[PDB]
Each structure stands twice: as structure tokens, then as C-alpha cells.
Design a protein around this ligand. Structure first.
Ligand SMILES: Nc1ncnc2c1ncn2[C@@H]1O[C@H](COP(=O)(O)OP(=O)(O)OP(O)(O)=S)[C@@H](O)[C@H]1O
Ligand SMILES: OC[C@H]1O[C@@H](O)[C@H](O)[C@@H](O)[C@@H]1O
Ligand SMILES: OC[C@H]1O[C@@H](O)[C@H](O)[C@@H](O)[C@@H]1O
Length: 354
């Protein structure tokens, strides 16, 4: 057993032995081939505090990035959460207009171990971005929005916090919705537009809008991008009056309809969530939004609501580091940093539209 031998040598070189004069014995090594976050279990007579003093050295000796070291079942077992030293992903990756894909509908959200995370909205039509305050889960949505705007999409932005998350500059490129009445009128219009698009597809014998657009020289349907800054603002009906609750009941239905039926019509939903709750990230939403982008959560319950797994509690504490899920994949990636002050240039969008 080569690996066991290598570790024994690395610890012997450090004279890293317990009160029994024994180097740590390797017990388990559970590896995640998607996130590249391993779980390394050891049995030693060495206190956890000595292991933590050796973090810098142990990283170089074992050639791993240590995320955490913690005590297990007994004060004789330690668990190391780590990534291999050869599993390099940047800790900082700024956005560059060079990452924009020429293929209409394709977006790039960041970098994984080998290459970029690309989402084809013609295949995976909706994106859910989950993350706590200061994670950068909204930076991802504005990045996606930028790329789609650069490809000539029509945009709608939903933020009931008076549109702070999308100021005056965003209003030059699209409609910023800040009230429940405007959201109800918007979502009703979106369900109706979607229904008109479906009948165009059925009538013309087209599989998607791309095919329909080939058939009609001057009647081209544009991709509609809808950015919902906070899903809970639409889904939580508590503490509102009878009238407002009924408006939110109806918006919940329009959103369900859109997520389910807007697949080949080019009407994409990019939803932000801060607090994973099954009353917000509903069975209907989860079943119809294939892409999940997830920041680090301390509670495995929060991660299970978003990803149907506990991997988001294992993420490194690096700002911009996220998990990407599409079907069977739960992949670690460093999101591009889309800085509004440097990167959101509204006049480039207005020039390209002609
Ligand atoms: N992709 C990223 N790469 C590096 N730093 C990032 C990234 N995203 C955000 N940050 C930083 O982390 C902090 C996040 O704050 P904001 O930029 O306001 O994020 P946001 O996208 O609006 O996210 P929240 O969840 O809604 S506060 C800032 O100090 C950013 O500089
Ligand atoms: O869904 C497609 C994506 O799958 C991921 O597993 C890969 O790491 C990405 O590079 C790719 O774009
Ligand atoms: O909010 C609904 C309205 O959205 C606008 O962007 C459209 O141009 C209108 O036709 C529509 O009635």
C-alpha cells in the first residue's frame, strides 16, 4: 500500500508521533470526484491542537490544501477535510469580456479544476443561485445577465428592496421591478408571452425559438432573461395584507408555470436565494430549475434544500468559491468576479442593440 507508506514516511520525517511513540495510522480516505474535497481519517495519540499547529507543514508534507481538522468519535481520531495540492482553482478570478461565448444562449460562470463552467440555456433553461450575505451569489446572476445582454437579450430584474441590487444603470438596459403589483403584471405578461411562443412553435413545427427564428426573416423572437434577486420576496406570504397575499399566490403560480413550460421558448429565470427554506425553494421550483449554484452553508439542511446533498458545508472559506450542480454533477468552481463599477457598461449594450 503505496499511499499508507508515503504518509508514514512524511510523519516519520516530522517525528510526528503520539505519547505511544506512534505516527498517525490512516483509517479512511473518502474522495469526492466532483468537488475534489477529500475526507482523511487518522488514529493518533496527538491532540487536535498539535495537528492544527502542523497545518502549514502537513500541507507540504502530504501535498494537500487543508480546509479543516476536527475531532471525531474519540479523542484518538482526527478528520481532515482537504483538497489535493494539484487540484488548483484560483482564489480570485475577475470577469473579462473575453469569456463571452459566441453561441447564443451559452454563459460562463467561472473556473473549475480543468476549464470553465459553461451553461447552455437552450439545454438547462433556469438557474438557482444560493448563498448567504457576502457570498457573491448575486454577482453570478449579474454576470450571467451581462453575458445575455451582450448577446442581445431583453431583461427584467426583480428586487423588492427598492432596486438597490440593480440601480439606475440597470434601468437603461431593462425594467427594474420593485413592487408586487408590477411583479404580478410582469409575470402574467411572461406566462402569456411564453404561451404565445409555444403556439408559434406548434404552428410552425419548430422544436425551439432558434428553429422558428430561421423560418421568419423579420419576426425574430428575442431571448428574455428574468433575474429574481430574492426568491423569498415572492414565496414568503407572511405579514402581508389579504390583497398582497393574493398577489403573491398568483405570482407563485406564474413562476411555477414558467419554470415548467419555458424550456424551448427562450424565457430564462435566474433566481437568487439567501436562506434555503423548503417553503421558498419548493418541490416545484427544484424539479424545474436544473442548475444550482451554491455558496458555503454551515447547516447541511440548507445545502440539502438546494442541492439534495450536504456538500455545500464542506466548501473552502474563499470568497467567490461555489458549488455547481446539473444532474449528477456537484462541482467546485471559482465564480468570476463581476464588479459593476468596472464591468457593467450600459452604453455598450445600447450600442450593440443599434
Ligand atoms: N466572484 C467573486 N470573487 C471574489 N470576490 C468576490 C466574488 N463575489 C463577491 N466577492 C466579494 O465578496 C463580497 C460580496 O459582496 P457583494 O459584492 O455585495 O456580493 P453580492 O453578489 O451582491 O452577494 P450577496 O449574497 O447578495 S451580499 C465583496 O466584498 C466582494 O468583493
Ligand atoms: O454541464 C457542463 C459542465 O459540466 C461540468 O462537469 C464541467 O466541469 C464544466 O466544465 C462543464 O461546462
Ligand atoms: O410589465 C409588462 C410589460 O412589460 C414590457 O416590457 C412590455 O414591453 C409590455 O408589452 C408589457 O405589458
Amino acid at each position: 500500500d503505496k499511499r499508507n507508506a508515503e504518509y508514514r514516511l512524511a510523519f516519520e520525517q516530522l517525528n510526528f508521533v503520539g505519547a505511544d511513540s506512534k505516527t498517525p495510522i490512516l483509517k479512511s480516505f473518502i474522495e469526492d470526484k466532483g468537488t475534489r474535497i477529500d475526507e482523511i481519517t487518522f488514529e493518533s495519540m496527538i491532540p487536535i491542537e498539535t495537528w492544527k499547529s502542523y497545518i502549514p507543514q502537513l500541507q507540504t508534507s502530504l501535498n494537500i490544501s487543508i480546509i479543516s481538522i476536527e475531532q471525531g468519535a474519540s479523542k484518538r481520531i482526527v478528520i481532515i477535510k482537504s483538497m489535493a495540492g494539484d487540484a488548483k482553482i484560483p482564489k480570485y478570478l475577475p470577469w473579462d469580456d473575453k469569456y463571452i461565448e459566441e453561441q447564443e444562449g451559452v454563459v460562463v460562470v467561472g473556473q473549475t479544476f480543468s476549464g470553465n463552467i459553461k451553461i447552455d440555456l437552450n439545454k438547462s433553461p433556469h438557474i438557482l443561485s444560493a448563498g448567504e450575505t457576502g457570498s457573491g451569489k448575486s454577482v453570478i446572476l449579474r454576470c450571467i445577465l451581462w453575458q445575455l445582454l451582450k448577446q442581445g437579450a431583453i431583461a427584467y430584474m426583480v428586487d423588492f428592496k427598492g432596486g438597490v441590487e440593480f440601480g439606475l444603470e440597470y434601468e437603461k438596459v431593462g425594467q427594474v421591478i420593485t413592487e408586487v403589483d408590477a411583479a404580478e403584471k410582469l409575470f402574467k405578461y411572461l406566462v402569456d408571452e411564453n404561451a404565445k411562443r409555444l403556439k408559434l412553435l406548434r404552428e410552425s413545427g419548430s422544436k425551439n425559438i432558434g428553429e422558428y427564428n430561421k423560418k421568419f426573416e423579420g419576426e425574430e423572437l428575442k431571448r428574455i432573461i428574468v433575474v429574481i434577486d430574492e426568491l423569498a420576496e415572492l414565496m414568503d406570504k407572511t405579514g402581508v395584507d389579504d390583497e398582497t397575499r393574493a398577489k403573491l399566490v398568483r405570482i407563485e403560480g406564474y413562476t411555477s408555470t414558467l419554470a415548467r413550460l419555458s424550456r424551448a421558448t427562450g424565457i430564462n429565470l435566474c433566481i437568487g436565494v439567501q436562506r434555503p427554506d423548503a417553503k421558498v425553494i419548493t418541490g416545484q421550483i427544484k424539479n424545474n430549475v436544473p442548475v444550482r449554484i451554491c455558496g458555503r452553508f454551515a447547516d447541511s439542511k440548507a445545502s440539502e434544500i438546494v442541492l439534495s446533498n450536504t456538500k455545500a458545508k464542506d466548501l473552502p472559506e474563499v470568497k467567490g468559491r461555489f458549488l455547481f450542480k446539473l444532474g449528477a454533477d456537484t462541482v467546485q468552481f471559482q465564480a468570476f468576479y463581476f464588479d459593476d463599477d468596472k464591468h457593467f457598461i450600459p452604453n455598450k449594450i445600447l450600442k450593440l442593440r443599434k
